[PDB]
Amino acid sequence: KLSGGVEWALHCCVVLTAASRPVPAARLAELHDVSPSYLAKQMQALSRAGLVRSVQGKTGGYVLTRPAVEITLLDVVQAVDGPDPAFVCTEIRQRGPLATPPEKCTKACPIARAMGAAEAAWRASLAATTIADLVATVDDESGPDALPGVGAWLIEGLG
Amino acid sequence: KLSGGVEWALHCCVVLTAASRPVPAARLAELHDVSPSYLAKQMQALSRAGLVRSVQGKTGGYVLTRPAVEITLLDVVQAVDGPDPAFVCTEIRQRGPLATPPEKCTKACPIARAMGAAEAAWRASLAATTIADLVATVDDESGPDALPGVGAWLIEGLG
DNA sequence: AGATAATACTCGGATAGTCTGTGTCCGAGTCAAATG
DNA sequence: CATTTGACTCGGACACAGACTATCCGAGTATTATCT
Ligand code: FES
Ligand code: FES
C-alpha cells in the first residue's frame, strides 16, 4: 500500500502549471480543504527533491523549476511516496538447511527478477506520461478557461 | 512499500510443485528459517483465496489444488498484501471553494487514468509470468534435480 | 529623496496522535493410528 | 473389525511496531514607513 498524500502534491503540481506568480502553501491547503501544515510538509518533501523552488519574504511561495513538459509522473512518485522500490528480496535462498551456495547464486532469484521487472514496467509506463500531457487533456475536457481561471483565483490579493 | 511476507508466500509456490504429499507450514518455516506462526498466518491468508488446500490431522499440510500453470504471480500478490489498489483517489476536485461541479465529473480524473494505466502494465507484467516459468528457470539455472530434491526433503518423516 | 530599522508574511524542520502491518499466541477440527 | 485415544493440523483472536497523518513554533526576507 502507498501514501495517499501523493495525490495532494500532484494536484498542486497541475494547478501550479497555470500559476505565473509565487503561491504560499496555506492558499493551496484551502484550495482543496487539507491540513495546511501537512501540505507544507509535502512541499518540503518536494523542495528536498529539487522539483519546486521555495522563495522567502512577503511575496514568498512555491514555483516550478523546469518547464512543464520535462516533469514526469515518475519524478513526483519517487520524490513523495518514497524512492525505495516496492518489493525487497530478504534472500531466503541462502537460509535454512538447503541454502544455495555462493557459487550457484550468480543470477538473481527469478521471483525477485520477475517482480523487479514488473515494478520497472510500472514506473516506466508511469514516466512515459508527463504533467504537460495531463494539463493538455484537462484543457481538452474541462475547458481551456477553467485552469487559467483557478490560476487567477490563487494569485488574488498577494500583499 | 509492499508487505515483506509476500516473498515468504511466493518462495513456497515453487516447492508445492515438488511436493506430491501434504506439507505443513512448520516444515517450510524451518526450510527458510522464518516465523513458523507468521508464515502460517500468510499461508492461511493464501488458503482463503482458494489457491491451495489446507488439510488437518496427522499427515495434513498444504497442497496445490489446481495446476501450477494457471497460478500467475498477480493472483498471489493480490491474495496476500490485499487486492485493493496501492494508490487511491479521494476525489479532492469536488472539495474546497473551487470544487469542480458534479456536472464536469462524467469521467475519472486524468491523474487516476495515468496511475491506472501504470498499475495495469504492472499487473500485466505479473499475469504474463506463471509458476511454469519459475520451475523452468530454477531447473534451468540451479539444475533440474534441485526441485525434486527439496520436494523430497519436505516429505522426510511425515508421521 | 535615500538610508535605515520596524514589520508582517512566509519556508523549514522538530514535535505529538493515530492506523495499518508484524509477530505471536492458543482453541476448534481432523486424520491416523493403537487397541480390545 | 468398531472404538477410544492421541497428537497433530489449521483457523482466527491477541499484543507490539514502524509508519502515515496532523500540528507547532523558530529562521529568513521583501514591504514599508519613518527619519535625516
Ligand atoms: S530470494 Fe527473495 S525473491 Fe528469491
Ligand atoms: S481528484 Fe483524485 S486523482 Fe484527481
Summarize the structure.
Chain A has 7 helices and 2 strands.
From the alpha carbons, calculate the radius of gyration of chain A and give it in angstroms: 21 Å
Each distinct ligand? FE2/S2 (inorganic) cluster
**Total helical elements of chain A:** 7
Strand count of chain A: 2
Shape of chain A: elongated
Q: State the distance separating the first and last CA atoms of chain A.
A: 42 Å
Strand content of chain A: 5-15%
Structural class of chain A: mainly alpha
Strand order of the largest sheet of chain A: 1-2
Assembly type: homodimer
Give the % helix of chain A: 40-55%
Strand and helix order of chain A:
HHHEEHHHH
Largest interface: A-B, 55 and 54 residues
Task: Describe the protein in words.
Chains A, B: Keywords: 2Fe-2S, Iron, Iron-sulfur, Metal-binding. Chains A, B: It comes from Streptomyces venezuelae (strain ATCC 10712 / CBS 650.69 / DSM 40230 / JCM 4526 / NBRC 13096 / PD 04745). Chains A, B: InterPro entries: TR_Rrf2-type_CS, Tscrpt_reg_Rrf2, WH-like_DNA-bd_sf, WH_DNA-bd_sf. Chain A is elongated. The first copy, chain A, has one domain. Chain A is mainly alpha-helical. In chain A, helix 1 packs across helix 3 and helix 2 (25-31) crosses helix 3. The first copy, chain A, has helices at residues 5-17, 25-31, 36-48, 73-80, 110-128, 131-141, 146-154; strands spanning 52-55, 61-64. Chains A and B meet through helix 1, helix 5, helix 6 and helix 7 of A and helix 1, helix 5, helix 6 and helix 7 of B. Residues 89, 91-93, 109, 111-112 of chain B line the site of one FE2/S2 (inorganic) cluster (FES). Residues 89-93, 109, 111-112 of chain A line the site of one FE2/S2 (inorganic) cluster. Chain A binds a DNA duplex (36 and 36 nucleotides) through helix 3.
